[PDB]
RNA sequence: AUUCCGGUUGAUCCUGCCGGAGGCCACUGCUAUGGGGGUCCGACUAAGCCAUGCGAGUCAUGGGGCGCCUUGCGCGCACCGGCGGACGGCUCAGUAACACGUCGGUAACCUACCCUCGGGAGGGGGAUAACCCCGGGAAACUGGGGCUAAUCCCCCAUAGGCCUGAGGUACUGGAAGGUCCUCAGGCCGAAAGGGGCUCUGCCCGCCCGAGGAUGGGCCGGCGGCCGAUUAGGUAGUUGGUGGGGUAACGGCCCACCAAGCCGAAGAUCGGUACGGGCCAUGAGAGUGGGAGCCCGGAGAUGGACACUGAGACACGGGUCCAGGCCCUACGGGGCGCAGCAGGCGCGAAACCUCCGCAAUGCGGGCAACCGCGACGGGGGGACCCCCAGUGCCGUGGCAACGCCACGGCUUUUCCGGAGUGUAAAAAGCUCCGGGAAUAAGGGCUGGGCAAGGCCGGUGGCAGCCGCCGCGGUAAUACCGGCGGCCCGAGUGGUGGCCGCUAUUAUUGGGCCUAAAGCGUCCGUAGCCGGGCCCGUAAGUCCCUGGCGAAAUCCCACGGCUCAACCGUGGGGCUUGCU
C-alpha cells in the first residue's frame, strides 16, 4: 500500500533458489545489488543451505562478518547480498571456489572450480552509453560498469562478452556474439544448454531478437539473444556444467 | 480457497446393499478388520491403481509411458504383480490381494501369530519387526522385499523360544491363505 | 439476569406507536413487564421482576432508547472458595500485575480480605466443598490454563517472599515488643529506615514504645514494617484506618515511591487515597455475606466513578439500583483537665454539651482524643479537673477493635440488650435492620469482616441505653454508604434518648453530616495536646484544616469531597478566603 | 552404550569438527549427555572442555539413537559461536543467575 | 458404480413433481481412550462499542553531558542527533472498475537503503537540547533566564542540476523530444575528510554524476455476474489548438474552436459482489463457492483536508466537522482494537488478558547484540486428515456369528519413575516397575432400506411419519423390555451447495391429445446457406521461441515407525496471451 516491501514470504520466493518453501514463513529478501531477483540468491542461503557451513543464520552472519567468503574477489559481509549467474564464490580458508550457474531445472547451483578460473568472470555487455568526457560506459549484466575509450568503442558491442579479472577489473578476452561462437543459455526452456550459434533473427519492433544454436550432439534449438551468454569462440573455456 | 486435507477412503454409494454387506462381512471376519473404514481404505487403494491403469491404456507416450513403468514397478515392489506384468493384470487385481499384503495377514502367515487377531495384538503391542524396525500399524502394506525380514522383536518375550505363547504358536506351524 | 432499562431522554411516547409494549412477549402473553405510567411523563416503565431480557423492545424502539443491562447473580461461576456450606462464596480473583499497584475497592462483606488471603497463601481456595482438605496441588491443576496459574505456582513453590499488612491492627499489636527503633532495625532488610521516618513523620514516636501507641501511630509502624521488609509482593489491607488526612497522604506517597517494581495490592475504603495510590482498581461486587464477584481492571478514577454510579461498563452490570449520595445534613460540663502520661501534656479547656447535641472531636494523629475518651469513661483519672455530673450511666467503644468473643451475634446483642433484637423496638428497625445484622445473626463473631464487626460494636454500644455515649474510630473499616447510615443511626438514637455523644474520628464527612458541635485538638503531636471549648462546625473544621494546611473541594451536584493538591489555585484561593472544606 | 560414528567433517570457518553418530542402546534407556560425551572423547581423544553435544534423539522402535556433537578447537570459539542454552545443557555454564 | 428406488389407478402405461439414497460446509443432540500431522477456530449477524496490558525500536565506533567504580581501564543513564517507524500484522465496508488475471508498453515517470564505475570533500559561521536557577498547571502539557557540542543548522565558492537557442552526428536502440561533443544566454545550486583502531595504513562512513537493481506510478490489448416490469445516455461530455499543472502522458484543469462519444453484440440506471490462484461436487460435460494459505487491491468510527519524508494524505502520527465515550479543580484535556490476548453487545454460531526471541525473518547497529503479541512454543476446542486402542490364547460348556467358566500371555493405552527431548517446560521417543486392569456409543428396527410373525402398555387418545403411511382392543409402524441391523470414537438432527436431475438438455429435453408453435403473413439485424476454378492465408491444424509465480493436483523416489506431512524430480493447472 503505502510504500515498499521489506519482507518476503518463503512461498512467494523466487523459483530458482532451492529454499524449502513450507518449512518456515519467511525468507531473506535480497537487497538491491549486482543482479536481479530472477538471477540471484542471497549469500545467507549459499552459506547455510548450499554449502552447509552453518545450520543457523547467526553462525552465517558471524562468518560473513569475519570475512571468510568472497564474491568476485571482494569480501561481502551482508547476508542479503545477491549472488548471481556466473559469479565466483570463494572460500580461501578451505581452498574452494564455486561458480553460481543455473541448472537445467532452472535453479541456481554451485559448480566447483579452482583458483585459475576463479580469478575470471565473464560479463555480457548488455548496453553502451556515451558519458561525459566523451567516454564509453559499458553497462553489464551484473549491473556493473566499465569505462573504455572511443578508440575501441567498436571492438566493444552490446551482446558481446568480456572476460574480466575481478579483484582488479582488467578486461581480457573480448568474446564477440557471432556465428560459431560458443554460447551458454541462462534462462528459458533451454536453460543450461550450450553450443555454437547458427542464426539470428531480428523481428521488427520491440520484439526481442532470437538466436538459433547448435549443441554438441548436433541438435538445433532456439532461444533469446538476451538469454544467450557467450563463453567462448569455439569452446566454452569457462568450465560450465 | 485453500487445500483442505481430504479422506483417503471412499464410502459406498448405498449403505444397505445386501450383496455388498455379505461380501464385506465375510472379508472382515477372514482378515480380522476393525473397520469398514479400513476395508474401504484398501478398496480405494485398488481403485486408484485401476484408474491409473485405465487412463494409461487410453493415453499416449513420452509421459503416460513413464507412469506406466512407475505403476508396474510400484506394484511389483509391493508384491501385487510379478515383474513380467501388465495393465491388464492391474485390472485383474483384487482387494483380497491388497489385504493379503497387509502386515497383520503376513504375520498370521509366516506362522508368527496363530490367528489374525493375535497378529494384530502382536503388532500393536510391539512384538513385530520389519527390517529391524518395529511397526505397530497392522495396515502397513509390506513390500515383497521386506517380507522375508519379518521377525519378532529382539526386545520381545515372544523372541524367547521358552515363551508359552511362542510355544503354542509353533505348536501350530501353519500358513498359506490368510 | 439481564433486564431492560430506558433512557427517558430519547423516549418519545407520542412519535413511537409504542412498539416496545406491543412487541413484548410478556405483555402479549398477558403479563406485565413494560407498561405506561404517570410516575413518569406518561412514559413506560420496566418491572425487573418480570422482564426476561430478550431485547425485542430494544430493537423495536426507533429511537434507540432501551438497552439491556446485567444484574448480578449467585448462580454462575467457577466458585473459588466457600467458607461454609451456606455462608459465603467467591467468584474470581484479580491477577496481581507484575509492576503496577492494584486496588481492590468493593464494599463491606464481599470478599476483599478473602481475596487477599488467597493471594497471600494464608488460606487455600477449596473451590466447592468447604471440606475436601486439599490445598496447593489440585488448586494449581484447576487453575491450569491461566496466568494466575503462574502466580500461584511461584507462590506455592515459595519463589516469592510475600508480606501482608493485615486488617486488624490490634491483633498485630499483640505480637511485638520493644520500641519502634529497634523493631525497625531488626525487621529491616533494605536500608530505608531514614526514608520511612521522613515520609510517615515518625520522628516523635521514634522512641516511644509500641504498647502505648495511638491507633494511627501503630498503623504507621506496621506499614513501615511492611515497606522495609524485602519481598516481591506487598499486600496492604486497609492501610488508611486510624489515620488523619495528611498522614494517609504521606502513606500513599511512601507506598508508591518505595514500591516501584513490585506486585502491590491495596484494599482501602478511602476514595481520596485510592485516586492517589492506585494505578488500577478492581471492584468487588455482590451481596454482603453471600457472594462476591471481581470486576475488570478499571483505572482508578473510572473505577471510582463507576462504583459510585453503580454501573460497570465492561460487564454491563447494574450493581446497585441507585448512586452513592454524599449527603449534607446543660447535661454535662467539666473543667479544664490537665493530664500527663509520662510525657504528652494534655489540656482541654472545658465545655457545656447542651442536651443531646453531638460533639465531634478532631485533631492530628497523636494528640489526645483517646486519652480524653478514656478519661470520660473513667479508665484514667485526670491529673486535674473532672466532669460534672459525674457518676452517670455510660457506654463506650474504643479503637482497639479485634475479634475476641467466641459466641454469635445473637448472643452478643442479647447480652448487650433486648432492644438490640426485639423487633418491638424502633431501635431494631432503625439500627440493626439498616445495618443489616439480621443477615448475620447466626454468624460467629470471630469470623466476620471488619465493618460487620464495627457495626456490631456500635450496635451494642447504642443499645446499651445510657446518658453518655463515646465512640472512637466508629467509621473505620467501613465503606461510604455505611458511614452515612451509621451516622444517621447514631444521630437518631442520640436524639431519641436526649443524651450526649462524643464521636472521635478522622472523617470530616461524618462530622459535617451529624456534628452540631466539635472540639479541635492542637499542639505538637505526642508532646502537647491543647484542645479547646466546643466550637461550631465550620469554624472547628477550618481550624483543624488550617492546621496541616490541607484543603478540600466538594462537588456541588453530588458532594464528593476531594483533596486539593498543595499549592493549587483552589488551595490558594480557599486558604486566602478561609473556606477550607467547601 | 555403543558409539558408532557416521560422519566427521571439519569446519575451518567456525573452527569445529562436526560429528554425527549412532548410539546403540539395546536394552537400555537412551543414554545421558554425560555418558555419551565420555564415550565420545574416549572413542576420539577430544578435549571435553570443548566438546559440546547438540542433540541425542531416539526414534520410534529403534533403540539406536542419532546424535550430533561439535568439537571446537578453542573454548573461546565455543563460547562465542555456540548458544548459551546448549552450553547450559552440556553443563559448561551455570546459567549466570 | 456413467445406477436407481417409493409415491397419482380398482389395475396399466406415461408425463411430471415431491421424497429417499451419496459427498462437502455451518450450527446442533447424545456420546467420547490415545498419539501424530496441518495453510482450522468472532468470516456468515454488529466495518458495532471497547476496561487493562503488550504489539517498533535501535545505534555509547555521531555529540556533549550526568552518575557509579579510590582512579585507570570500564559500567550505567537519559538527552540531542541519525536510521527505521510508509514493512510486517488485521479486516472485506466500499468497489462491476484497467480493481483483478494475463500478454505487453513507458522513447511519458519517481525511487532512501544496495552494487559498479568515475570524481569530489575547499572556506567560514551560528544556534539549541541535555545540564544549572526559578517555575506554572488538577492533569494533559508547558514558560523564562544561563551554558554547550555535534555526522545538527546556515552561508560562500567550485563541481553539478534544469530550461532555451544554434549545429556536430560519436552511442544505444526496432525507432530519438534521449545520451554525447562545441558554443551561447540564463536560473537552481552539494558535501561529514566525520568517527574508530594495531594510525602514516586500515575499517565504517559524507556529496555529485552515469548506469543497474529493488519497489512503485501511469497506458494499452484480451479476459471474467444479474436485471429491458431499466432505452436512450453524456455537456468537460468526444475531439482539436494553445497552455497550465504533474515525477510523468493525459480534458487532469483552464481559455478558445467544433460536434462529437456510448448504445438494442444492451449503453445508462439499478442489484449483488473485494479480484484471482484455488475450493466443493460430479463419469465427464457442467453446476456452485471465492473467510482461513499466497498474489494483488482497498480500508482503519463516518466525511474532508494537510505536515514531514525516498515513499503517507499515514491502523499503534496531525487538523476540522458529524456522532459517541472517558478524566476534570468545569478552566480544560483525551479516546475510537477491522493488531495479540481479553471483554460488552449481537447472535443458532468460534479459544488464553500464557511462554520466548532459541529458530525463521525484519529494523537498527562496524560488530557483538537488542527489540519485535510478526513468527515460534504451548495450552482450550468432537476443525480437517493419518495411525491405533477398548485385549489375546488355549481347553470345557451354552439359548454355539459370539458369551460363560478354568488356566496362560501381552501391555499399544492407564498409573509411577529415569534419561533424551525443549529457549525452558510439556508432549513424543528409549528404558524400568505395576497390572486385563482404565476405556463404546449413536441411530434404526413396515417399505423405500440392512435388521423382530417376540413380549408388556396405550387404544383415532397419546404419539410416530424425509415420502408412502401406522395408530379407533390381537399395533412387527407409538411408549417400553428383550433381541437384532448399520456405522462406530463417533453417530444422529437442522440449514446450504453439488449430485440425484436428460427437472435447464452444447454433449443431451420436449411443444396433436400431458406444460408448451406467435391468429396469419411480410421483412431489418442476427444466424444458416448450392456447385466448379483461381487467389489470400483471417479463423483452423502442425512445429517452434517467450510467458502464464509458488502453494494446491497426479506420479515415482526418498525422510519423520509406515501413513498423513515434508523434500527431490517428472507431469499437469491457470480462459491463456504472444
Ligand atoms: N473464616 C470465615 N469463616 C466464615 N465466614 C467468614 C470468614 N471470614 C469472613 N467470613 C464472612 O465472608 C464475608 C466476606 O468475607 P471478608 O473478606 O472478610 O469481607 P471484607 O471484604 O474483608 N469486608 P470488610 O473487611 O468489612 O471491609 C463476611 O461477611 C464474613 O462473615
Ligand atoms: N500509657 C501511656 N503512657 C504514656 N504515653 C501514652 C500512653 N498512652 C498513650 N500515650 C501517648 O499519648 C499520646 C496520645 O495518645 P492517644 O490519645 O491514644 O492518641 P490519638 O491522639 O488518639 N491518635 P489516634 O488514636 O491515632 O487518632 C500519644 O503520643 C501516646 O504515645
Ligand atoms: S422506548 Fe421507544 S417504543 Fe418505548 S415509549 Fe420510548 S420511543 Fe416509544
Ligand atoms: S427485554 Fe423483552 S421481556 Fe424484558 S421488558 Fe423488554 S420486551 Fe419485555
Ligand atoms: Mg476486610
Ligand atoms: Mg487513639
Ligand atoms: Mg414406484
Ligand atoms: Mg465482527
Ligand atoms: Mg478470518
Ligand atoms: Mg552554495
Ligand atoms: Mg461487500
Ligand atoms: Mg472499532
Ligand atoms: Mg464451532
Ligand atoms: Mg420405520
Ligand atoms: Mg422443473
Ligand atoms: Mg421433458
Ligand atoms: Mg503453479
Amino acid at each position: 500500500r503505502k510504500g515498499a516491501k521489506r519482507h518476503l514470504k518463503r512461498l512467494a520466493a523466487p523459483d530458482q533458489w532451492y529454499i524449502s518453501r513450507k518449512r518456515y514463513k519467511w525468507a531473506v529478501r535480497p537487497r538491491p545489488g549486482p543482479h536481479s531477483m530472477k538471477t540471484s540468491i542471497p549469500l545467507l542461503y549459499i552459506v547455510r543451505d548450499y554449502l552447509g557451513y552453518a545450520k543457523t543464520a547467526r553462525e552465517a552472519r558471524k562468518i560473513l562478518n569475519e570475512g571468510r567468503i568472497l564474491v568476485d574477489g571482494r569480501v561481502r559481509r551482508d547476508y542479503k547480498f545477491p549472488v548471481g549467474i556466473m559469479d565466483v564464490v570463494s572460500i580461501p580458508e578451505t581452498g574452494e571456489h564455486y561458480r553460481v550457474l543455473p541448472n537445467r531445472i532452472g535453479k541456481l547451483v554451485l559448480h566447483p572450480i579452482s583458483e585459475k578460473e576463479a580469478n575470471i568472470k565473464p560479463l555480457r555487455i548488455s548496453n553502451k552509453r556515451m558519458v561525459k568526457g566523451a567516454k564509453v560506459q559499458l553497462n553489464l549484466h551484473d549491473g556493473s560498469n566499465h569505462l573504455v575509450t572511443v578508440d575501441d568503442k567498436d571492438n566493444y558491442r552490446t551482446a558481446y562478452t568480456v572476460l574480466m579479472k575481478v579483484p582488479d577489473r582488467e578486461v581480457i578476452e573480448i568474446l564477440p556474439f557471432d556465428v560459431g561462437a560458443y554460447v551458454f543459455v541462462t534462462r528459458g526452456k533451454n536453460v543450461a544448454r550450450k553450443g555454437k550459434i547458427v542464426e539470428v533473427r531480428r523481428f521488427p519492433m520491440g520484439w526481442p531478437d532470437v538466436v538459433t544454436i547448435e549443441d554438441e550432439n548436433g541438435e538445433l534449438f532456439d532461444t533469446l539473444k538476451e538469454y544467450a551468454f557467450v563463453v567462448g569462440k569455439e569452446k566454452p573455456e569457462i568450465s560450465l556444467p | 480457497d485453500p487445500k483442505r486435507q481430504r479422506k483417503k477412503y471412499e464410502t459406498p454409494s448405498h449403505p444397505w446393499i445386501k450383496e455388498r454387506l455379505d461380501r464385506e462381512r465375510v472379508i472382515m471376519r477372514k482378515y480380522a478388520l476393525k473397520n469398514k473404514k479400513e476395508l474401504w481404505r484398501h478398496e480405494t487403494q485398488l481403485k486408484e491403481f485401476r484408474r491409473r491403469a485405465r487412463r494409461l491404456l487410453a493415453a499416449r507416450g513420452k509421459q503416460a509411458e513413464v507412469e506406466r513403468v512407475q505403476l508396474l514397478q510400484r506394484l511389483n515392489r509391493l508384491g501385487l504383480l510379478p515383474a513380467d506384468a501388465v495393465l491388464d493384470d492391474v485390472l485383474s487385481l483384487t482387494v483380497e490381494d491388497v489385504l493379503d499384503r497387509r502386515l497383520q495377514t503376513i504375520v498370521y502367515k509366516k506362522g508368527l501369530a496363530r490367528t489374525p487377531r493375535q497378529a494384530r495384538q502382536l503388532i500393536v503391542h510391539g512384538h513385530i519387526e520389519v527390517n529391524g524396525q518395529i511397526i505397530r500399524s497392522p495396515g502397513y502394506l509390506v513390500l515383497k522385499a521386506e517380507e522375508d525380514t519379518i521377525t519378532y522383536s529382539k526386545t520381545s518375550p515372544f523372541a524367547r523360544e521358552s515363551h508359552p505363547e511362542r510355544m503354542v504358536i509353533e505348536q501350530a506351524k501353519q500358513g498359506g491363505e490368510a | 439476569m439481564r433486564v431492560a432499562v430506558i433512557n427517558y431522554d430519547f423516549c418519545k411516547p407520542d412519535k413511537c406507536n409504542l412498539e416496545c409494549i406491543n412487541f413484548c412477549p410478556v405483555d402479549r402473553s398477558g403479563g406485565k413487564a413494560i407498561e405506561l405510567s404517570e410516575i413518569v411523563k406518561g412514559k413506560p416503565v420496566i418491572y425487573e421482576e418480570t422482564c426476561i431480557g430478550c431485547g425485542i423492545c430494544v430493537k423495536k424502539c426507533p429511537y434507540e432508547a432501551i438497552s439491556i443491562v446485567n444484574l448480578p447473580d449467585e448462580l454462575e461461576g467457577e466458585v473459588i472458595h466457600r467458607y461454609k456450606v451456606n455462608g459465603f462464596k467467591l467468584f474470581g480473583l484479580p491477577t496481581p500485575k507484575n509492576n503496577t499497584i492494584l486496588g481492590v475497592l468493593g464494599k463491606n462483606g464481599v470478599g476483599k480480605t478473602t481475596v487477599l488471603k488467597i493471594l497471600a497463601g494464608e488460606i487455600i481456595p477449596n473451590f466447592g466443598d468447604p471440606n475436601s482438605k486439599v490445598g496447593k496441588d489440585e488448586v494449581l491443576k484447576r487453575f491450569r490454563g491461566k496466568e494466575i496459574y503462574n502466580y500461584f505456582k511461584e507462590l506455592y513453590s515459595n519463589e516469592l517472599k510475600i508480606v501482608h499488612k493485615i486488617q486488624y491492627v490490634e491483633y498485630a499489636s499483640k505480637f511485638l515488643k520493644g520500641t519502634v527503633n529497634e523493631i525497625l532495625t531488626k525487621i529491616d532488610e533494605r536500608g530505608k529506615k531514614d526514608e520511612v521516618k521522613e515520609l510517615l513523620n515518625m520522628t516523635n514516636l521514634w522512641n516511644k514504645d509500641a504498647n502505648i501507641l495511638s491507633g494511627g501511630g501503630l498503623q504507621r509502624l506496621l506499614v513501615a514494617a511492611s515497606l522495609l521488609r524485602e519481598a516481591d509482593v506487598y499486600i496492604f489491607d486497609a492501610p488508611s484506618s486510624y489515620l488523619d488526612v495528611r498522614e494517609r497522604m504521606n502513606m500513599a506517597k511512601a507506598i508508591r515511591e518505595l514500591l516501584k517494581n513490585k506486585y502491590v495490592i491495596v484494599v482501602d475504603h478511602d476514595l481520596i487515597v485510592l485516586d492517589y495510590l492506585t494505578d488500577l482498581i478492581h471492584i468487588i461486587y455482590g451481596e454482603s455475606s453471600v457472594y462476591g464477584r471481581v470486576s475488570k481492571s478499571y483505572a482508578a478514577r473510572v473505577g471510582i466513578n463507576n462504583f459510585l454510579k453503580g454501573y460497570l461498563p465492561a460487564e454491563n452490570m447494574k450493581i446497585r439500583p441507585d448512586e452513592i449520595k454524599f449527603m449534607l445534613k446543660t447535661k454535662m460540663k467539666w473543667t479544664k483537665i490537665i493530664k500527663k502520661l509520662g510525657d504528652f501534656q494534655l489540656v482541654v479547656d472545658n465545655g457545656e454539651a447542651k442536651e443531646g447535641e453531638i460533639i465531634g472531636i478532631l485533631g492530628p494523629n497523636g494528640i489526645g482524643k483517646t486519652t480524653f475518651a478514656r478519661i470520660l469513661v473513667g479508665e484514667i483519672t485526670a491529673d486535674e479537673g473532672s466532669v460534672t455530673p459525674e457518676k452517670q450511666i455510660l457506654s463506650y467503644k474504643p479503637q482497639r477493635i479485634f475479634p475476641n468473643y467466641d459466641g454469635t451475634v445473637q448472643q452478643y446483642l442479647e447480652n448487650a440488650s433486648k432492644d438490640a433484637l426485639s423487633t418491638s423496638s424502633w431501635f431494631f428497625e432503625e439500627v440493626t435492620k439498616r445495618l443489616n445484622l439480621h443477615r448475620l445473626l447466626e454468624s460467629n463473631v470471630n469470623d466476620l469482616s471488619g465493618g460487620e464487626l464495627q457495626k456490631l460494636y456500635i450496635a451494642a454500644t447504642l443499645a446499651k441505653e445510657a446518658d453518655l455515649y463515646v465512640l472512637d474510630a466508629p467509621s473505620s473499616y467501613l465503606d461510604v454508604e455505611e458511614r452515612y447510615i451509621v451516622a444517621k443511626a447514631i444521630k437518631r438514637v442520640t436524639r431519641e434518648r436526649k443524651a450526649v455523644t462524643f464521636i472521635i474520628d478522622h472523617d470530616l464527612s461524618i462530622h459535617d453530616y451529624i456534628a452540631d458541635r466539635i472540639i479541635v485538638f492542637k499542639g505538637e503531636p505526642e508532646k502537647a495536646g491543647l484542645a479547646t471549648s466546643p466550637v461550631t462546625l465550620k469554624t472547628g473544621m477550618n481550624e483543624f484544616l488550617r492546621e496541616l494546611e490541607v484543603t478540600f473541594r466538594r462537588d456541588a451536584e453530588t458532594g464528593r469531597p476531594r483533596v486539593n493538591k498543595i499549592g493549587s489555585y483552589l488551595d490558594r484561593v480557599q486558604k486566602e478566603r478561609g473556606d477550607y472544606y467547601s | 552404550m555403543e558409539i558408532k560414528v557416521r560422519e566427521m567433517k571439519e569446519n575451518r570457518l567456525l573452527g569445529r569438527k562436526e560429528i554425527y553418530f549412532d548410539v546403540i542402546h539395546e536394552g537400555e534407556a537412551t543414554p545421558s549427555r554425560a555418558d555419551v560425551k565420555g564415550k565420545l572423547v574416549a572413542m576420539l581423544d577430544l578435549n571435553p572442555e570443548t566438546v559440546v553435544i547438540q542433540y541425542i534423539r531416539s526414534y520410534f522402535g529403534s533403540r539406536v539413537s542419532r546424535g550430533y556433537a561439535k568439537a571446537y578447537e578453542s573454548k573461546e570459539r565455543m563460547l562465542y559461536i555456540e548458544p548459551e542454552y546448549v552450553l547450559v545443557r552440556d553443563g559448561i555454564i551455570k546459567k549466570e543467575e
Side-chain angles (χ1 to χ4, degrees), chain A residues 4-240:
Chain A
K5 274 183 180 121
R6 303 280 82 194
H7 297 73
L8 187 71
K9 279 173 182 170
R10 199 174 268 254
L11 285 174
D15 65 278
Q16 44 93 28
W17 270 17
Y18 277 120
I19 177 58
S20 187
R21 297 176 103 83
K22 295 185 118 180
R23 180 69 181 78
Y24 313 91
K25 197 85 203 289
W26 299 114
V28 172
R29 180 161 199 105
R31 282 257 164 69
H35 299 84
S36 51
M37 264 171 90
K38 320 199 288 175
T39 51
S40 296
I41 188 170
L43 200 66
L44 191 85
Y45 294 123
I46 278 172
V47 173
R48 192 189 42 196
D49 297 334
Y50 279 51
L51 311 180
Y53 282 119
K55 328 301 164 287
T56 288
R58 205 166 287 287
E59 296 177 344
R61 282 191 260 94
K62 271 154 188 160
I63 287 159
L64 293 167
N65 283 293
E66 290 168 60
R68 318 307 195 73
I69 290 92
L70 318 162
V71 187
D72 312 322
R74 314 217 199 180
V75 182
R76 298 295 183 187
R77 295 201 158 70
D78 191 9
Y79 70 100
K80 315 180 70 150
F81 187 76
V83 192
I85 280 165
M86 277 152 191
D87 276 352
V88 183
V89 173
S90 302
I91 303 98
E93 192 75 33
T94 68
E96 305 179 347
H97 304 261
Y98 303 90
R99 212 171 267 295
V100 190
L101 286 157
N103 226 2
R104 193 82 176 80
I105 292 94
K107 305 206 185 160
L108 297 183
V109 294
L110 296 181
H111 181 36
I113 63 182
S114 55
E115 293 67 14
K116 189 191 168 56
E117 177 179 341
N119 301 292
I120 309 297
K121 185 165 173 21
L123 298 168
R124 200 200 156 86
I125 273 169
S126 166
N127 216 325
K128 191 170 158 207
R129 303 310 185 296
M130 182 49 50
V131 308
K132 211 164 280 301
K135 261 176 281 185
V136 189
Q137 196 198 50
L138 310 169
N139 307 119
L140 321 163
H141 81 100
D142 64 316
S144 287
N145 295 305
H146 189 245
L147 273 172
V148 310
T149 169
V150 295
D151 315 331
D152 44 359
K153 60 168 205 179
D154 302 299
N155 301 113
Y156 288 96
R157 286 286 150 87
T158 43
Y160 288 20
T161 284
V162 179
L163 298 184
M164 185 69 85
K165 190 184 180 182
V166 284
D168 303 331
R169 285 184 83 72
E170 266 74 9
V171 168
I172 39 163
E173 202 152 10
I174 294 155
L175 301 159
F177 206 103
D178 54 45
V179 171
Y182 214 80
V183 79
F184 177 83
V185 187
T186 54
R187 196 166 185 73
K189 209 183 71 54
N190 289 299
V191 188
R193 268 179 104 177
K194 36 160 163 184
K196 297 189 184 190
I197 289 159
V198 176
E199 187 177 359
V200 191
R201 309 182 189 75
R202 198 61 45 85
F203 306 123
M205 289 175 81
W207 303 121
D209 302 358
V210 166
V211 298
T212 304
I213 292 150
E214 188 179 328
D215 75 324
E216 186 58 294
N217 313 332
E219 276 72 2
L220 186 138
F221 59 93
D222 297 347
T223 197
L224 298 182
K225 188 189 189 194
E226 53 169 321
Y227 299 170
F229 196 108
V230 182
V231 284
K233 287 179 268 261
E234 45 264 5
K235 61 175 76 181
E237 87 184 8
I238 214 69
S239 173
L240 279 157

Side-chain angles (χ1 to χ4, degrees), chain C residues 6 10-13 16-20 44 60-63 65-66:
Chain C
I6 295 163
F10 301 167
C11 163
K12 303 174 205 176
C16 71
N17 275 313
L18 281 88
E19 314 195 26
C20 66
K60 285 283 153 291
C61 193
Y63 321 118
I66 304 165

Side-chain angles (χ1 to χ4, degrees), chain C residues 501-513:
Chain C
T501 303
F502 270 110
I503 57 186
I504 294 92
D505 204 340
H506 313 258
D507 194 301
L508 309 152
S509 325
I510 303 305
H511 283 289
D512 198 330
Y513 190 44

Side-chain angles (χ1 to χ4, degrees), chain B residues 159-173:
Chain B
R160 193 183 71 251
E161 297 292 328
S162 70
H163 198 259
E165 288 288 341
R166 172 63 152 148
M167 273 205 302
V168 184
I169 294 157
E170 68 202 340
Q171 273 157 29
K173 286 306 295 174

Side-chain angles (χ1 to χ4, degrees), chain C residues 6-52:
Chain C
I6 295 163
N7 197 359
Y8 286 124
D9 307 61
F10 301 167
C11 163
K12 303 174 205 176
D14 318 320
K15 312 158 67 67
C16 71
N17 275 313
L18 281 88
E19 314 195 26
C20 66
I21 61 172
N22 295 332
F23 291 64
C24 169
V26 177
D27 291 6
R28 282 186 170 183
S29 281
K32 204 194 276 169
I34 310 153
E35 197 61 48
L36 297 165
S37 174
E38 277 68 350
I39 302 307
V40 286
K41 296 293 105 181
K43 285 192 165 102
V45 302
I46 281 153
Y47 305 98
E48 310 188 340
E49 55 262 16
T50 39
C51 168
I52 58 175

